[PDB]
Amino acid sequence: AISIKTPEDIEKMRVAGRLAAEVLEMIEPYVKPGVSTGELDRICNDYIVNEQHAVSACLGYHGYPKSVCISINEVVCHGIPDDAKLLKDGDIVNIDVTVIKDGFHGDTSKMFIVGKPTIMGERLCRITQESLYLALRMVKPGINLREIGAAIQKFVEAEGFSVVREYCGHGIGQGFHEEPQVLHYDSRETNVVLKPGMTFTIEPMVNAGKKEIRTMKDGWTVKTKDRSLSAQYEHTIVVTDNGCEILTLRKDDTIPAIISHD
Numbered sequence: 026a027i028s029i030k031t032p033e034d035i036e037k038m039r040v041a042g043r044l045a046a047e048v049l050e051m052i053e054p055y056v057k058p059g060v061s062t063g064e065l066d067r068i069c070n071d072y073i074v075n076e077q078h079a080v081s082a083c084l085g086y087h088g089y090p091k092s093v094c095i096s097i098n099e100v101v102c103h104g105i106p107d108d109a110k111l112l113k114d115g116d117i118v119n120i121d122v123t124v125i126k127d128g129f130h131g132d133t134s135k136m137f138i139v140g141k142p143t144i145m146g147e148r149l150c151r152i153t154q155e156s157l158y159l160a161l162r163m164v165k166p167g168i169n170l171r172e173i174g175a176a177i178q179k180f181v182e183a184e185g186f187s188v189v190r191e192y193c194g195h196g197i198g199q200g201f202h203e204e205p206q207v208l209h210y211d212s213r214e215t216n217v218v219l220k221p222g223m224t225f226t227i228e229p230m231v232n233a234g235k236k237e238i239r240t241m242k243d244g245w246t247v248k249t250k251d252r253s254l255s256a257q258y259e260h261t262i263v264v265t266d267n268g269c270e271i272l273t274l275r276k277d278d279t280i281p282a283i284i285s286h287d
């Protein structure tokens with residue numbers, strides 16, 4: 026059941042993708058020491074609803090109570106925004122946004138460094154983004170997803186970090202999480218050949234320490250087992266005839282929006 030988007034579908038995804046990217050571009054100036062994650066969530070929500078006239082796909086999903094996911098430091102993913110959680114100098118934080126517009130989803134995330142960065146945090150964020158970019162450069166019709174997961178893993182590991190196994194990229198479109206599962210590591214279980222019109226996300230979570238993770242009692246928050254820092258970046262893409270197009274590209278991305286192979 027891997028859905029192939031029509032040209033019309035892709036046009037709608039381009040819109041939803043840009044909206045999502047825009048939320049991330051917009052929030053930047055607000056990310057400073059002393060701000061709470063609860064406030065960031067409110068600002069995002071307002072923008073999405075009142076300015077963009079869109080909807081957050083997260084709010085209510087399986088009961089998720091907020092509009093975006095904000096994961097600080099050792100929180101891997103799904104961090105829940107809260108008025109009591111204040112950002113400090115040196116924190117690294119991921120803001121993951123998924124917007125729905127005209128029934129199509131746009132899913133993307135990036136890391137932000139609060140105030141003065143630490144050596145580890147900067148490095149970790151950089152390597153994580155680079156691992157995503159590497160993956161994007163490989164995307165093209167005919168290739169097996171497995172190769173992509175394997176490349177990410179090799180890269181990350183060579184740099185002294187680890188890749189989280191449990192969470193993965195996913196198809197996306199009218200549905201939030203569609204087939205297929207996009208693994209960020211090498212697995213003999215993976216056997217999917219890419220074809221034009223497929224749309225999915227790549228969103229590697231990398232840990233400064235060991236790969237092990239743990240789910241909190243809240244049922245959402247995921248943290249590293251060894252409390253090391255964790256970083257993630259995400260983009261939604263569409264496979265094209267000779268490469269791919271990045272639907273959630275932002276002003277700060279340093280990769281071209283269209284990647285062509287020849």
Ligand code: MET
Pocket residue numbers: 083086089094103121122123132133228259
């Ligand atoms: C708690 S919903 C998490 C969704 C997230 N935006 C993803 O990439 O799947």
Ligand SMILES: [Co+2]
Pocket residue numbers: 121122123132133134259
């Ligand atoms: Co996401």
Ligand SMILES: [Co+2]
Pocket residue numbers: 132194195226228259
């Ligand atoms: Co995603």
Ligand code: NA
Pocket residue numbers: 096097098099100101117118119254255256257
């Ligand atoms: Na984090």
